[PDB]
Amino acid sequence: TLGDVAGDVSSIEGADLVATPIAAGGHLAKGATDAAMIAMDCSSIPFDEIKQQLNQRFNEVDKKLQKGAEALENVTELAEKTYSSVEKMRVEMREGFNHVIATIENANTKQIITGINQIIQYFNDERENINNRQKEDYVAKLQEPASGNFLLYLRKSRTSEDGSLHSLLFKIINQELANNAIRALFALFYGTQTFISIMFYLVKQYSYLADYHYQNGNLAEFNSNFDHMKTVFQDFKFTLIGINTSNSKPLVNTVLSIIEDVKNKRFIRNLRSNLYQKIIKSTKSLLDLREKITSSVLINFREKSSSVPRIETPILKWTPGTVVKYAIQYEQDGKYSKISKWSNPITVQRLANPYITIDKDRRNRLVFRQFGNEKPELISILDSSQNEFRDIHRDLYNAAQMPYKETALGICRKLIDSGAQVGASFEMGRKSIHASATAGNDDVARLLLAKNNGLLNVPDKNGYTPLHIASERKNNDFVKFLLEKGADVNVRTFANELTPLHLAARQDFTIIVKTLMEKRGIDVNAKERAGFTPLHLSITSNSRAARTLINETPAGINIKSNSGLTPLHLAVLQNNLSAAKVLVKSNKKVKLNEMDNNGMTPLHYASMLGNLEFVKYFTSEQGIDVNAKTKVKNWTPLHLAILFKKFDVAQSLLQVRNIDISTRADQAITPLHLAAATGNSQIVKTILNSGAVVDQETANGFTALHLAIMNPNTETPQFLIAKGANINAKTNDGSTPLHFAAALGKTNIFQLLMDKGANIKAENLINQMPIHEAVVNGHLAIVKMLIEQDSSLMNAKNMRDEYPFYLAAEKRYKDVFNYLESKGADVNEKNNDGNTLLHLFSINGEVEVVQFLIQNGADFRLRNKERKSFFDLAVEFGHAGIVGYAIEENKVDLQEPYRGKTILYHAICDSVKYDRIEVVRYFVETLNEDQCSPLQEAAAYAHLDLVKYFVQERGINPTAFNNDNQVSPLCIAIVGAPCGFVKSCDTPERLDVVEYLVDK
């Protein structure tokens, strides 16, 4: 919500301090209140993230060039639009791409996938790394040598070139037509999204640096950077719209074709694919826009010079002995084209009389002229013709800008006598009069008053009137002597409309605001773009400005601003005590409880910022409106003080005046819970000494006891014990704090709970025995005491088919496991209800806990209740790796006859029963086939995946031998004589392999 930031920085008053109230509104607009949030182990994260976003907003706003530097700001805004849209896509894609790490190592060559992941994260980190520097540091580090176009060099052609992985990856999705395919498809999808992000960001940053160094830096490398981003944009245009036959197909269109083939598959998958379908629209929009972009003008022009001998003037602003190098640029319909050349840079010892022999054109020409250094660099903005008049106009403008008024009057007289026509625009704006206003020169304007229409109301690029410009120049008497002409007094500027009264407030000019107020009866409480009065914009000046403006004239002392900010609010924020004092001493109709847009009063800001003197002054002086509920969910300043870990202010606010403790803040939150969350013994003891409730359960069913337990502090537990708190408590789930106490891992607090009658027998709606938590979190001592207390109740059953030793197992903590096994716990063969525990983990795809318990001495050769082998179970769900580690452990290589079955008879049956491709690939990794032809076994049930895989990993035809029409699986599948697997041939797999065999 950086738009709110812009609206609230329209008043330059307190940018960061007036950015804090949007964090306060986020506190007010987001449904934060719940026990996890109250623990504040979270709150710091969202608030720090909001502060970091605000820091990004500020350290990008301060880099921005104001207006009218080079017309390619249209290109820049096109950038920000399309770019930022790419991040609306990319932020949502990020949470999904976090999931792909779960299924790592399913392809042999996933190192390229992790390489692209680390590359994209590397530049995502660098974006914020560079994005927090200073202006000069920003430009220097974007000009940093030995890296330069580091991103361009990295993204040009690398060993991890996406074209190589592109074909094989589309083969992986072709497998998905029949998973790792989803994982790597989304890897490349995020890849192309971040590639378009790279392109937009790169062209944006080239544009920004071109503008930055084009503001009087140098036009030469400005044109160089112009060519640079033109080349980059057309390079991407070629890479994704290629008009070369001997070139790779565009990535975006091939991805699209994959999307149609996937939807043609008509199969189910994870919701990640659904997010992909949601992002399809964004991808196609980005495509269409990228081909519709092609921006700036594409051409340059040529011109010449000519010395006009009409008049001769001795001039010093036109410095003698300097070069007359000039150049022109194109500017039409809000676009620009840069050029840089002066074939005849001359150093004539004459006036500004040399005109330009510019060839006529249909495009408006901006003509600059150069001494050989950094100049205004804006002299003519013409359409058809001009004969050296622009140079005279530039001399007039810069002379007006000169502060030497005593000589400015003489030089302006001598130039206007020569015919220095006025009204021309400079720096793409009507300036000259405003340049004089900046310099504060008097006689120059008083003799230009011949053009009464101009000086009266001439606007600027942003509509800055000469009154607006002179209002921030300390030039009081000159404003006096130029005001008699009767200029408009409610006139404003174009963008971020402001009156000169509005703008004078920040610059602390009491004399100037006086000068304004004792002339006519001018409006004083006039608003502006964000709905602010000049009173609001004065307090940061922290001097006599506002103190004067309060009482010297009637004004908008209490006016509801559009942002909801009043002088009281600002005086609170920017920590201006004297302004608050003088505002209180006015004793006019200054309402104190005037709500803002958010819904919380200046006292609330004072508490949140944690300013002691403001709080006590507010509690003492006014004696009115010192504690009340807020607009939506009824906060108090004390609540804010507790939340933001400000203590001294908290007990000060308690001791200044009676503040009700029975308050009903959101979810009936009394500040006892908040104080417990902070964990300050003196604060909580003082609150209880104030007659506070001891065991008030909140609307979520939480009391301060649980939350205090989750706090690291250990004293307020005993404090709550002493102050009569129900030890046997019921949370939102009806849970008991023993669960949380064990979860955190405080042995001594747990012992105290046990001493005061806590009951281990307690549970929740899903009957969580505290042993479950005590083992999943993991610690020795809690287990020791609970055993010594009540024999673990033989580790009773949970909701799922779980025996607490199971959780202790997949936790894999050495000491507790050894303790449980030594003193008697669940063991592998006690799983008689179904198969054994080893036979049970492999069903749920266990990888490491099985191996670690085997090396923990657990037996291996047990036979399950279902006669079906542990190796076979490992094979059945893609876990033959455990069989391999059994081989290296030398458990047994199952080639010995089990009911006549050997290693080959164990590779056949399960790979027919289940489609574990990786297990077959591991079997062939342990290189052997034993003349097996699993293609024909698959075709016995006509499974196309396995027959295609055998074809691709062997190359032999699916029918190598011949017989009396019975050896071929095609005839077996089609004729289906003895009703064996015939009545269920309706499955398309029965005709799938038919074609892959007919084709050969």
Short mmCIF file of N, CA and C in Angstrom, two decimals, residues 826-922:
data_model
loop_
_atom_site.label_atom_id
_atom_site.label_comp_id
_atom_site.label_asym_id
_atom_site.label_seq_id
_atom_site.Cartn_x
_atom_site.Cartn_y
_atom_site.Cartn_z
N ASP A 826 7.69 -49.45 23.21
CA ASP A 826 7.20 -50.19 22.05
C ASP A 826 8.38 -50.74 21.25
N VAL A 827 8.22 -51.95 20.72
CA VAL A 827 9.28 -52.62 19.99
C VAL A 827 8.69 -53.14 18.68
N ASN A 828 9.58 -53.48 17.75
CA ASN A 828 9.19 -53.75 16.37
C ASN A 828 8.14 -54.85 16.27
N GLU A 829 8.32 -55.94 17.01
CA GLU A 829 7.41 -57.07 16.86
C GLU A 829 6.09 -56.88 17.60
N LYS A 830 5.95 -55.81 18.39
CA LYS A 830 4.68 -55.55 19.06
C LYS A 830 3.64 -54.90 18.15
N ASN A 831 3.83 -54.93 16.84
CA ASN A 831 2.90 -54.34 15.88
C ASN A 831 1.98 -55.40 15.27
N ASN A 832 1.56 -56.37 16.09
CA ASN A 832 0.90 -57.57 15.59
C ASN A 832 -0.48 -57.29 15.00
N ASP A 833 -1.03 -56.10 15.22
CA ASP A 833 -2.36 -55.80 14.69
C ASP A 833 -2.38 -55.89 13.17
N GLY A 834 -1.36 -55.35 12.52
CA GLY A 834 -1.17 -55.53 11.10
C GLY A 834 0.20 -56.10 10.81
N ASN A 835 0.97 -55.42 9.97
CA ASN A 835 2.36 -55.78 9.75
C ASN A 835 3.23 -55.16 10.84
N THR A 836 4.52 -55.44 10.81
CA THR A 836 5.40 -54.94 11.85
C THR A 836 5.76 -53.47 11.60
N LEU A 837 6.41 -52.87 12.60
CA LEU A 837 6.75 -51.45 12.54
C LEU A 837 7.66 -51.14 11.37
N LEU A 838 8.66 -51.98 11.13
CA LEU A 838 9.49 -51.81 9.94
C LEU A 838 8.66 -51.96 8.67
N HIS A 839 7.76 -52.94 8.65
CA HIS A 839 6.83 -53.08 7.55
C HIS A 839 5.82 -51.95 7.51
N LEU A 840 5.73 -51.14 8.56
CA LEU A 840 4.76 -50.05 8.63
C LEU A 840 5.31 -48.71 8.17
N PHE A 841 6.56 -48.39 8.50
CA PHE A 841 7.13 -47.12 8.06
C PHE A 841 7.23 -47.04 6.54
N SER A 842 7.67 -48.13 5.90
CA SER A 842 7.89 -48.09 4.45
C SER A 842 6.60 -47.83 3.68
N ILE A 843 5.44 -48.18 4.24
CA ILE A 843 4.18 -47.85 3.59
C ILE A 843 4.02 -46.33 3.49
N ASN A 844 4.35 -45.62 4.57
CA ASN A 844 4.26 -44.17 4.60
C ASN A 844 5.52 -43.49 4.07
N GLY A 845 6.31 -44.20 3.27
CA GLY A 845 7.45 -43.58 2.60
C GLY A 845 8.54 -43.09 3.51
N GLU A 846 8.82 -43.81 4.59
CA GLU A 846 9.90 -43.42 5.49
C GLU A 846 11.25 -43.68 4.83
N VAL A 847 12.21 -42.78 5.07
CA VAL A 847 13.51 -42.82 4.42
C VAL A 847 14.65 -43.06 5.41
N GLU A 848 14.72 -42.27 6.48
CA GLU A 848 15.90 -42.26 7.34
C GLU A 848 15.67 -42.88 8.71
N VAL A 849 14.47 -42.75 9.27
CA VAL A 849 14.19 -43.29 10.60
C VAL A 849 14.35 -44.80 10.60
N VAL A 850 13.93 -45.47 9.52
CA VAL A 850 14.10 -46.91 9.43
C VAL A 850 15.57 -47.28 9.51
N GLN A 851 16.41 -46.62 8.71
CA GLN A 851 17.84 -46.91 8.72
C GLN A 851 18.44 -46.65 10.09
N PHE A 852 18.05 -45.55 10.72
CA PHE A 852 18.62 -45.20 12.02
C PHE A 852 18.18 -46.14 13.13
N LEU A 853 16.96 -46.67 13.08
CA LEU A 853 16.58 -47.67 14.07
C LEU A 853 17.22 -49.02 13.78
N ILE A 854 17.47 -49.35 12.51
CA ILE A 854 18.23 -50.56 12.20
C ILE A 854 19.64 -50.46 12.78
N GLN A 855 20.30 -49.32 12.58
CA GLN A 855 21.60 -49.14 13.22
C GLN A 855 21.47 -48.95 14.72
N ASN A 856 20.25 -48.73 15.23
CA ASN A 856 19.98 -48.77 16.66
C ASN A 856 19.68 -50.17 17.16
N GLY A 857 20.07 -51.20 16.42
CA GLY A 857 19.95 -52.57 16.88
C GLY A 857 18.60 -53.22 16.66
N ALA A 858 17.66 -52.53 16.02
CA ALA A 858 16.36 -53.14 15.75
C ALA A 858 16.51 -54.29 14.76
N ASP A 859 15.73 -55.34 14.97
CA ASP A 859 15.84 -56.54 14.15
C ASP A 859 15.32 -56.26 12.74
N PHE A 860 15.66 -57.16 11.82
CA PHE A 860 15.41 -56.95 10.40
C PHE A 860 14.69 -58.11 9.74
N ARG A 861 14.97 -59.35 10.14
CA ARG A 861 14.51 -60.53 9.41
C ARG A 861 13.10 -60.96 9.78
N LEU A 862 12.33 -60.11 10.46
CA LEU A 862 10.96 -60.48 10.80
C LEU A 862 10.11 -60.59 9.54
N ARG A 863 9.17 -61.53 9.57
CA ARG A 863 8.18 -61.68 8.51
C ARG A 863 6.86 -61.10 8.98
N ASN A 864 6.24 -60.29 8.13
CA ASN A 864 5.02 -59.61 8.51
C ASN A 864 3.85 -60.59 8.57
N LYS A 865 2.75 -60.11 9.16
CA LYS A 865 1.52 -60.89 9.21
C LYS A 865 1.00 -61.22 7.82
N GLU A 866 1.33 -60.42 6.81
CA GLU A 866 0.80 -60.58 5.47
C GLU A 866 1.76 -61.32 4.54
N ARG A 867 2.82 -61.93 5.09
CA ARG A 867 3.77 -62.78 4.38
C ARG A 867 4.59 -61.99 3.35
N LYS A 868 4.36 -60.69 3.22
CA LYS A 868 4.85 -59.93 2.08
C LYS A 868 6.08 -59.13 2.53
N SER A 869 7.17 -59.26 1.78
CA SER A 869 8.51 -58.99 2.29
C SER A 869 8.73 -57.50 2.57
N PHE A 870 9.61 -57.24 3.55
CA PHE A 870 10.03 -55.87 3.85
C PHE A 870 10.74 -55.25 2.65
N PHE A 871 11.63 -56.01 2.01
CA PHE A 871 12.21 -55.55 0.75
C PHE A 871 11.12 -55.28 -0.26
N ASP A 872 10.12 -56.16 -0.31
CA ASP A 872 9.05 -56.02 -1.29
C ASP A 872 8.21 -54.79 -0.98
N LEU A 873 7.93 -54.54 0.30
CA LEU A 873 7.23 -53.31 0.67
C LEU A 873 8.04 -52.08 0.30
N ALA A 874 9.35 -52.11 0.52
CA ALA A 874 10.19 -50.99 0.12
C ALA A 874 10.12 -50.76 -1.38
N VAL A 875 10.10 -51.84 -2.15
CA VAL A 875 9.96 -51.74 -3.60
C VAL A 875 8.60 -51.17 -3.99
N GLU A 876 7.55 -51.51 -3.24
CA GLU A 876 6.19 -51.19 -3.66
C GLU A 876 5.89 -49.69 -3.70
N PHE A 877 6.69 -48.86 -3.02
CA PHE A 877 6.39 -47.44 -2.97
C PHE A 877 7.62 -46.61 -3.29
N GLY A 878 8.48 -47.11 -4.18
CA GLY A 878 9.64 -46.35 -4.58
C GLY A 878 10.70 -46.18 -3.51
N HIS A 879 10.96 -47.21 -2.72
CA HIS A 879 11.94 -47.13 -1.65
C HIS A 879 12.90 -48.32 -1.68
N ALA A 880 13.29 -48.76 -2.87
CA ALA A 880 14.32 -49.78 -2.99
C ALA A 880 15.69 -49.27 -2.55
N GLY A 881 15.83 -47.97 -2.33
CA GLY A 881 17.07 -47.46 -1.75
C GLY A 881 17.36 -48.09 -0.40
N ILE A 882 16.31 -48.31 0.40
CA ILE A 882 16.48 -49.00 1.67
C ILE A 882 16.94 -50.43 1.45
N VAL A 883 16.45 -51.09 0.40
CA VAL A 883 16.97 -52.41 0.05
C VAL A 883 18.46 -52.32 -0.27
N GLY A 884 18.85 -51.28 -1.01
CA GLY A 884 20.26 -51.09 -1.31
C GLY A 884 21.11 -50.91 -0.06
N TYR A 885 20.67 -50.05 0.86
CA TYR A 885 21.41 -49.87 2.11
C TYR A 885 21.39 -51.14 2.95
N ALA A 886 20.38 -51.99 2.80
CA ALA A 886 20.44 -53.31 3.42
C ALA A 886 21.54 -54.15 2.79
N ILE A 887 21.72 -54.04 1.47
CA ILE A 887 22.80 -54.76 0.80
C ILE A 887 24.16 -54.29 1.30
N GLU A 888 24.36 -52.97 1.40
CA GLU A 888 25.63 -52.49 1.95
C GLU A 888 25.76 -52.86 3.42
N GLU A 889 24.65 -52.88 4.15
CA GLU A 889 24.63 -53.43 5.49
C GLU A 889 24.77 -54.95 5.48
N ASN A 890 24.67 -55.56 4.30
CA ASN A 890 24.78 -57.01 4.13
C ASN A 890 23.73 -57.75 4.95
N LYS A 891 22.51 -57.20 4.96
CA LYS A 891 21.39 -57.93 5.55
C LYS A 891 21.16 -59.24 4.80
N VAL A 892 20.72 -59.14 3.55
CA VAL A 892 20.67 -60.27 2.62
C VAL A 892 20.40 -59.72 1.22
N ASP A 893 21.00 -60.33 0.21
CA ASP A 893 20.63 -60.07 -1.18
C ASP A 893 19.64 -61.15 -1.59
N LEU A 894 18.37 -60.76 -1.77
CA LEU A 894 17.26 -61.71 -1.81
C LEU A 894 17.23 -62.46 -3.14
N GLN A 895 18.33 -63.16 -3.41
CA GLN A 895 18.40 -64.07 -4.55
C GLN A 895 18.10 -65.50 -4.16
N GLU A 896 18.14 -65.82 -2.87
CA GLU A 896 17.87 -67.16 -2.38
C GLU A 896 16.39 -67.50 -2.56
N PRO A 897 16.07 -68.78 -2.74
CA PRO A 897 14.69 -69.15 -3.09
C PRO A 897 13.70 -68.97 -1.95
N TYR A 898 12.87 -67.93 -2.06
CA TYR A 898 11.72 -67.74 -1.19
C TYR A 898 10.49 -68.11 -2.00
N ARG A 899 9.83 -69.21 -1.61
CA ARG A 899 8.76 -69.85 -2.37
C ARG A 899 9.10 -69.89 -3.86
N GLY A 900 10.37 -70.13 -4.18
CA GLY A 900 10.84 -70.16 -5.55
C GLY A 900 11.19 -68.81 -6.14
N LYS A 901 11.15 -67.74 -5.36
CA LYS A 901 11.40 -66.40 -5.88
C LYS A 901 12.83 -65.96 -5.58
N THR A 902 13.46 -65.34 -6.57
CA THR A 902 14.79 -64.76 -6.47
C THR A 902 14.71 -63.27 -6.78
N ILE A 903 15.88 -62.62 -6.84
CA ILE A 903 15.93 -61.17 -7.06
C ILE A 903 15.16 -60.79 -8.31
N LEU A 904 15.29 -61.58 -9.38
CA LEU A 904 14.54 -61.30 -10.60
C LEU A 904 13.04 -61.52 -10.39
N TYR A 905 12.66 -62.60 -9.70
CA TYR A 905 11.25 -62.82 -9.36
C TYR A 905 10.71 -61.83 -8.35
N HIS A 906 11.57 -61.10 -7.64
CA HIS A 906 11.09 -60.01 -6.80
C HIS A 906 11.04 -58.68 -7.54
N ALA A 907 11.86 -58.51 -8.58
CA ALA A 907 11.77 -57.33 -9.43
C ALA A 907 10.59 -57.39 -10.38
N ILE A 908 10.17 -58.58 -10.79
CA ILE A 908 9.04 -58.70 -11.71
C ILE A 908 7.72 -58.40 -11.01
N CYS A 909 7.43 -59.14 -9.94
CA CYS A 909 6.07 -59.16 -9.40
C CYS A 909 5.64 -57.78 -8.90
N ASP A 910 6.51 -57.09 -8.16
CA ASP A 910 6.11 -55.81 -7.60
C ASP A 910 6.07 -54.72 -8.66
N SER A 911 7.05 -54.71 -9.57
CA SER A 911 7.03 -53.73 -10.66
C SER A 911 5.87 -53.96 -11.61
N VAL A 912 5.25 -55.14 -11.58
CA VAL A 912 3.98 -55.32 -12.26
C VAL A 912 2.83 -54.82 -11.39
N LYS A 913 2.86 -55.15 -10.10
CA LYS A 913 1.79 -54.73 -9.20
C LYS A 913 1.73 -53.21 -9.08
N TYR A 914 2.88 -52.56 -8.95
CA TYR A 914 2.96 -51.11 -8.84
C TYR A 914 3.89 -50.58 -9.91
N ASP A 915 3.77 -49.28 -10.18
CA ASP A 915 4.46 -48.63 -11.29
C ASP A 915 5.67 -47.84 -10.82
N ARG A 916 6.43 -48.38 -9.87
CA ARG A 916 7.58 -47.66 -9.34
C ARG A 916 8.70 -47.64 -10.37
N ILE A 917 8.77 -46.57 -11.16
CA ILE A 917 9.77 -46.48 -12.22
C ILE A 917 11.16 -46.34 -11.63
N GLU A 918 11.30 -45.56 -10.56
CA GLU A 918 12.61 -45.36 -9.95
C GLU A 918 13.18 -46.65 -9.39
N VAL A 919 12.32 -47.57 -8.93
CA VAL A 919 12.82 -48.85 -8.44
C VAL A 919 13.38 -49.68 -9.58
N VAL A 920 12.70 -49.68 -10.73
CA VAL A 920 13.23 -50.39 -11.89
C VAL A 920 14.54 -49.76 -12.35
N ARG A 921 14.63 -48.43 -12.31
CA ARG A 921 15.87 -47.76 -12.65
C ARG A 921 16.99 -48.04 -11.66
N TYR A 922 16.66 -48.26 -10.38
CA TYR A 922 17.67 -48.67 -9.41
C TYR A 922 18.09 -50.12 -9.64
#
